[PDB]
Assembly symmetry: C5
Homo-oligomer: 68 residues x 5
């Protein structure tokens, strides 16, 4: 499902090396290392991202994301 | 063949780690990890890309792309 | 704890491959390779970063950081 | 030898994972993956590059390049 | 010691995978792969870099650098 669509409010590198982004008031994290620079680049340019996952409650993990 | 030439409309990181880009109204995906940052950079800067592949219908894979 | 929140005044690549950033007048270092490009991008763009660690005195290590 | 010195006219990711650039009307390819993002950045900012190799005819391989 | 401080005049990817930068009229090289994208980004944006090493003559190696 499309869990959230919006700008990245903040991003955060976590101690376990996962990466959290806050979109549409909800936080989601991913363990895919390659998405770190891609998500930060979207954040910097103010691009809209769509967090895609089976679980959409805040604090959930995701591994799929559309840029624009 | 040159399947599509134009700016990337959107890109998507897939759960299976492949990467999809939509160019000239058609979607294409690649499994080449090195293309991910090159494609996202082309998207953020509005570079014109030419998706090259023997299969050009929307939903097809590719591994070759020219950046202008 | 939130050790420092501000722009990165300088970053430095160390001989042991760790990376140091100076934020709010204090220096912090991290051994997480993935953070290097993220922290440099933040520095180049003037992003506000929050260094998160249980040890916040100048010269402390960290592995967690929020980008705003 | 200095094979070509000029702006990157176009770059291309090849199916065999090599990367081609066209400079001063000639095509050069490299198998050094680390060069890909460096060459694409030079291309985006319009920086002059000097392709260095012992073989300088169009279609030759290289692994050395000066930026500016 | 602080060997040189200024903008990167040019950078060069070498055949042995090392990376050279020219700062304040002197060339320095490093074998640290991680420094490549950091040094190139510094060069592209005009950041001031300070090359730190015990050997400061042109042609010397380094593995420590500050980005301002
Ligand atoms: C001699 C002719 C026999 C049949 O022709 C081949 O048909 C297949 C269709 O099944 C074609 O395969 C397709 O090739 C394209 C590239 O031309 C794509 O493959 C590339 O991209 C994928 C995904 O990124 C992989 O990286 C492959 O290694 C790439 O080559 C497409 O996914 C693939 O189905 C083939 O081109 C015809 O020659
Ligand atoms: C009397 C109480 C002692 C027990 O508490 C622990 O104390 C130590 C101090 O010696 C704390 O260790 C410090 O933890 C921070 C993060 O909170 C830093 O460690 C992180 O960063 C480094 C460098 O990048 C490494 O990546 C570590 O893996 C990270 O956790 C700091 O460097 C470290 O000294 C500890 O937090 C307390 O629980
Ligand atoms: C010494 C043997 C007699 C002739 O000298 C050598 O001739 C060969 C011609 O086949 C030259 O090989 C060419 O070398 C250049 C660099 O000068 C290119 O090789 C580089 O780039 C490729 C592709 O990226 C690889 O990374 C190589 O490792 C690099 O060295 C070119 O592709 C290659 O054909 C050789 O230089 C002469 O000494
Ligand atoms: O003009 C640059 C060129 O770069 C890429 O091709 C390279 C050489 O130009 C080309 O001669 C060489 O062809 C070889 C293949 O390497 C090999 O895999 C195959 O078995 O034989 C052919 C010769 O028949 O390939 C290198 C790349 O390794 C790029 O593929 C090409 O489109 C063009 O951009
Ligand atoms: O990236 C290349 C290289 O950088 C660092 O080494 C530098 C020089 O390459 C190296 O020659 C030099 O060696 C010095 C020692 O520092 C000094 O203690 C000794 O007495 O004399 C030699 C004289 O050559 O060291 C500098 C760094 O100060 C880095 O240390 C090295 O690992 C490597 O990455
Ligand atoms: O329309 C593009 C899609 O690309 C990816 O899927 C492809 C292919 O289209 C599909 O049939 C196959 O099952 O998986 C491929 C990836 O390995 C994405 O996964 C899709 O979401 C579309 O973007
Ligand atoms: O002037 C800097 C040079 O850096 C690289 O060479 C260094 C060093 O200068 C040289 O003496 C040694 O043999 O190799 C080093 C790299 O491992 C480049 O190879 C040179 O072309 C210069 O750029």
């Amino acid at each position: 499902a499309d869990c959230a669509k919006g700008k990245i409010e903040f991003s955060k590198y976590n101690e376990d090396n996962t990466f959290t982004v806050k979109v549409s008031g909800r936080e989601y994290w991913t363990n895919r290392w390659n998405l770190q620079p891609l998500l930060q680049s979207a954040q910097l340019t103010g691009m809209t991202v769509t967090i895609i996952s089976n679980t959409c409650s805040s604090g959930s993990g995701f591994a799929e994301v559309q840029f624009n």
